[PDB]
Amino acid sequence: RAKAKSRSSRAGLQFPVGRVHRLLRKGNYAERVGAGAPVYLAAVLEYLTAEILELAGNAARDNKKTRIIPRHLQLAIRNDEELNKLLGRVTIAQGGVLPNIQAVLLPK
Amino acid sequence: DEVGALVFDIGSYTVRAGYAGEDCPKVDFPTAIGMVVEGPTYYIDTNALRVPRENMEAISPLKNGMVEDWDSFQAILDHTYKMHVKSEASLHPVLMSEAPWNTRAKREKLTELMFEHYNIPAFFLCKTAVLTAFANGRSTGLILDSGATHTTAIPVHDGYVLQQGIVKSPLAGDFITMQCRELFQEMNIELVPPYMIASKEAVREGSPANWKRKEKLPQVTRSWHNYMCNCVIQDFQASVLQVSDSTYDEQVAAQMPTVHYEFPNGYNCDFGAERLKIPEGLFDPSNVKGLSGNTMLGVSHVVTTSVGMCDIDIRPGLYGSVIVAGGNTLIQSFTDRLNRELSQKTPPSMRLKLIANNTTVERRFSSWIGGSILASLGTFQQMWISKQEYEEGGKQCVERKCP
């Protein structure tokens, strides 16, 4: 047959469209899944991941570190306005918190 | 990078000529051709060959991958040029295959015959093992070629053959044809070639053949008759024979489904263990009657001896790049039995792996595909022995220009 092309490469994404479609079709989500749903889902997930990774890398460079650690993830999430709202009810292990000291508890 | 050339693979069974860069040869025609003094004439494509014609004469142009009759070889070349290639030789280089055991004398004689008779602009003579390796995609490995005349294991290292590591055995298509002949004579099967049959009728299994002989058959020599009979026997081989998975056991062979086959004369019958007992000699000649000799080496024995006669440092590469090729390798379960025996006999310290080039085109035309992809390379454009090279260095320049 012709050289097989993957759906992820065809669309222009990196996340596994095949595995996303497998999960969607065998899961509780629906009886059968259309070809466009998993592509869209994988694209959205890839975009969220790219955004959070950019923020984490920025935090890492700020802290003078080459490896993104959960600190750089927690700081990124709690510094970003929209990602914070997205992951408000999500805790990250070994991520820590922000140095948000109330102005009322400072030396006077 | 690509240049219009001519790739030739002249084996003892078939000759494959074509252009460099194609996945398949332009024309493949048997090598065991006849001869008729019309002077001596020769044929190609099997349609001018398998014809009942007055006074069919014997001839053997090339045996064991080496030229046996230079006149018949030149005639075959001329016919391949003017009949099927249909192009002047001076317009296309020539990359021709040769057996590793070819002699320097035959090499130089072929070079001078190609440079002074056809006036080809460039010439190259490559070994069948190197060509098979280049086709299969490996520069180091053991090429196992089981042709019509011999079964040979040839170790190639970095694109060069190690003569001291080569091993050969006479158990080949000729041995298989002899065994089929003996089986037919034992089962009382009259081997009738097609050219002797005018008409036939359908008869029950195992019953005598009801066929009529032609009334105006021409004069044909015993050699041509044996050639037709060997063609029929090779058809029977390709349609019936099968290699045993494990060492031949009569009890296990008597529990295998039979294979039905009908000869040209209409005699049709089923074969049971006799079709699996013949191909066993290729791997174990000790159980073959009429072969009272233990010095003969089976396929696995040849492989192991060829690997052992090489430097221990390269044996891992040979075991890991063992390449299987040849016409006899198309027999069912042949490569399975080979892999089993090699895994049993090879030290586990060295990884064993056989290339899966099991297709008919990949197997029988491996030596030609190799030359095609080797001549279709820009790098290879510097290894061409030019007409000027021949004129300046003479016939002996071949040994230095193409090992």
Binding site: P70, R89, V90, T91, I92, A93, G96, V97, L105 | -
Partner: protein, 81 residues
């Protein structure tokens, strides 16, 4: 086991409060924090053991804890493979 809630000492609770931003801590805050942590662990481990028993397993895996935290609303990354 017994009285292992006392394995959360005043220095540990004071470090947990420092990480939350508290500057000055009272005396009964430590008891209140122990009681709250115990109530939270009770529900989390009850959900985990409910996910475990149902699986006929004898070991509480990390996925059980993850699912319990998701049920309780505390989605936890870093332990989901």
């Amino acid at each position: 086991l017994r009285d292992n809630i006392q394995g959360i000492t005043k220095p540990a609770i004071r470090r947990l409060a420092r990480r939350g931003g508290v500057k000055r801590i009272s005396g009964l805050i430590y008891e209140e924090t122990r009681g709250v942590l115990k109530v939270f662990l009770e529900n989390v481990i009850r959900d985990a053991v409910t996910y475990t028993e149902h699986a006929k397993r004898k070991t509480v895996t990390a996925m059980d804890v993850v699912y319990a935290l998701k049920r309780q609303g505390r989605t936890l990354y870093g332990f989901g493979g």
